[PDB]
Amino acid sequence: RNRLWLLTILVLLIPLVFIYRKYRKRKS
Amino acid sequence: RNRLWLLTILVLLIPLVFIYRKYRKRKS
Amino acid sequence: RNRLWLLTILVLLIPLVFIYRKYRKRKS
């Protein structure tokens, strides 16, 4: 009811990174 | 009575962002 | 035949794109 289930969960989070790319205004 | 299985299906979908990086089409 | 568990393993992989951002810029 957890642990292994948690690993499956992490990927769902990854669409967040794409949103960050859009913000990419200036390099730092 | 449990959409937990459905959440697992979503995770497979995020590799799309990785594909965008390969394009390197600057802005878009 | 039936490898539903295998499909979940693919899902773990997308966090890799986020990791590249952590590395920053190299080239050198």
- DSSP-derived secondary structure for chain A: --THHHHHHHHHHTHHHHHHHHH--S--
If you measure CA to CA, which chain B residue comes closest to A11?
A: B11
Q: Determine, for residues C15 and A20 on separate chains, whether the beta-carbon distance falls below 8 Å.
A: no
Print the domain residue range for B28: 1-28
Judge whether B17 and A11 are in contact, CB under 8 Å.
no
Rounded-to-integer distance, Cα C15 and Cα A10, Å: 7
Burial group, residue A6, by CB count within 10 angstroms (0-12, 13-18, 19+): exposed
B15–chain C Cβ distance below 8 A for any pair:
yes
Q: Measured on CA atoms in the order B13, C15, B24, A18, is the torsion positive or negative? A: positive
Rounded-to-integer distance, Cα C28 and Cα B6, Å: 44
C21–chain A Cβ distance below 8 A for any pair:
yes
| Structural domains in chain A (count) | 1
